[PDB]
Amino acid sequence: MDVLSKGSLKELLAHLEKTPLEEAISYRIGTVPYQNVLISRNEYYNQLYPDTTSLIDGVSREGQRNVNGLIMSIISYVVSGSGHYIPNIGFMLLRRSILDILTKHDTGLVTNNLNYGIIARNLTVSKMNCEQRKRMLICFKLLAYKDGNQNDYEIYLNQNIPLKQIAPNFIPGDMRTVIHNQDQLAIVGIPAYRLTQSTELSIRDDNAKSYKLGYVDWYNSNSFLRERSEFNLIRLKDRDTKYGKLNGW
């Protein structure tokens, strides 16, 4: 819910630096993806509504115990709010931040062999929306510059024209690019339209709506930080300053 509320490249990247990798993984076994299922949607129909389980739903699913599965779980957390079930990774990797896993060689993970075609295919990209695609392209760009595969990233974008049109423009090593970027990456927020407490047919839409109504409850709760009222109560380390920049950028 917190990750899905980030609306800018600065806020999203700042959140990924603070959060550790254990948030990306989940310890609930869940079910398996790519399975045709019959779910119950009684507000609309009496029969059982068919659908297909995927990795993009907000429910935890069993994942493969490899580097491919770890990256899919990280991107799933960013674009959906929940990750997968990959246990016994190791406390050394789980303490590090999501950004460090994505763009630092010191962690020890090897991601050079990863192919963006199957990752996009597995993390079903024909079913994503514009905001979800932009976040995935951010993760691909961060990984590509980590292993020096910028040329491969460009060729992949040139093959898929719609991805190129919405691809965010920022250099992973430069902080000025993050500041200048004005893409909207928010999947949940205060809605201008009328948001009701009703169900949606698809698994993806129902889970997304639950996060949206959950954010409204959290926005009006006591855990939210109203800057206009209590800006002098935050500590100096976490106060918003223009001089602030990501570590190593």
Binding site: N220, R226, S229, E230
Partner: protein, 50 residues
């Protein structure tokens, strides 16, 4: 002293809130739920009230 007064006088204030909300129509109440604010009270006033 604060606890004793609070237990003694909670019934009157509970009725007061019910009466005040009875004065607000429904359309006004849903409109007022969109707004938010924080009220600042001096520490002397808060203790003296209780």
């Amino acid at each position: 002293a604060c606890r004793d007064k609070t237990s003694a006088n909670w019934r009157g204030y509970s009725v007061l809130v019910s009466r005040y909300r009875s004065l607000i129509p429904n359309e006004l109440f849903e409109s007022l739920r969109n707004i938010s604010g924080e009220y600042n009270i001096n520490p002397q006033d808060e203790h003296s009230f209780f």
